[PDB]
Subunit: 118 residues, 4 copies
């Protein structure tokens, strides 16, 4: 139920395919930041989750470079797929920008995105 | 520069090749935690970073399931590679465990790993 | 706008006094975790924030030790206060537990809390 | 043995006093970012840690306003004190800036500092 098109609270578009091998592949489109259009993503998920009602641990990465722009940054999302009536993917993320030594202390942003199919 | 074998402060081994497309592929072996053997990784990196000496942004994911165990979790490392006499990859990571919504507050660990050759 | 009673989404209760000082004092009641009753908090805030509409930066700390219990852990919330009809305090937090240096790779949890007047 | 003068890898200066009741007070001086001289800090620590060799959980806040400047930001450090030969405090920190609703996705930085007495 992870496969498909999801949207986060910012309006970004997350188009994913969950592979039988635990592979996550698709595209990301950010509604904010130093980005336009679609970027390649790749990630992994637990292809055999618990059955105690636990959610499904997953992760994916986007390097913010494509044919039109390069922000010299990468975001990783970590969280879990929670299926059911209201399916949702709950994440926290790290966005690291390429910096010089002077700026490394402030290289990494952290946040949380919530994805739904609606 | 990135392709190769890397070790972090915990004794884990990160084996990756950086494709020219900006794909990261490889294998991760953790020294600690609910793990044993190798796990598949995949990620992405800035295959055209700035010329000013900034580092190279990158990220990768490991779900902790292989033929041996399944921790029912995934880690994502977000960082940058820095070349030099001492090449380094400095990261921050998020380790999320599957949980019921009751314990979702405690699902996600945060940490930092430094990789070196 | 900061002083008073606030609630997050776990149902925890945050009772603060914002000192002229830049001081934050109060008590925290957490709904979830190895917790019981009220705990002392202390923190700091920008007592001269931007006029330009930006939020009011703040942070606080709770060590989870009181008369009833001691979880040997500490949470810090970092965030910002946002005035308006729906006042909110939007935070990210770090929960560190005391561990041996074996398990220290799993000592710190991260998450986010949104506090509302209701 | 938390009271005293500590330095992190950036060469910032962390002067702290741990009171009986679990209080933390002191002064923080950053070697980096939008800061100059000392800023008041405040926090909490577990005043009755385990004895199994586990470290002492602690956390503190700095709002980055003093008589010289104001960055409209606040940093929290969450971590633990670890005694012995190499007495150190290992932390993770969250640095939130006051932003408008629009740029809140980039309000929060994350990092880690290691404090030593040398
Ligand atoms: O600004 C950049 O460096 C690239 C764009 C980053 C957009 C971020 S990734 C985390 C968050 N979630 C989104 O949908 N967009 C932002
Ligand atoms: O215990 C688990 O749930 C799976 C193993 C996680 C090990 C972590 S991932 C971050 C850190 N870096 C490492 O090399 N190992 C730990
Ligand atoms: O160690 C424990 O379990 C006690 C910590 C309290 C639970 C956490 S603190 C962050 C989050 N926000 C809350 O209101 N509760 C949890
Ligand atoms: O907003 C600002 O730039 C002032 C924040 C101070 C810089 C930070 S706090 C985390 C890190 N550790 C330090 O000793 N300094 C930086």
């Amino acid at each position: 139920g992870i496969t498909g098109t999801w949207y986060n609270q910012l309006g970004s578009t997350f188009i994913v395919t969950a592979g039988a091998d635990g592979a996550l592949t698709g595209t990301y489109e950010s509604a904010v930041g130093n980005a336009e259009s679609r970027y390649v993503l790749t990630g992994r998920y637990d292809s055999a989750p618990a059955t105690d009602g636990s959610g499904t641990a997953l992760g994916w990465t986007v390097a913010w470079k494509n044919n039109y722009r390069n922000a010299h940054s990468a975001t990783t999302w970590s969280g879990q797929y929670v299926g059911g009536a209201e399916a949702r993917i709950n994440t926290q993320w790290l966005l690291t920008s390429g910096t010089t030594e002077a700026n490394a202390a402030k290289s990494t942003l952290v946040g949380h995105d919530t994805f739904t199919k609606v």
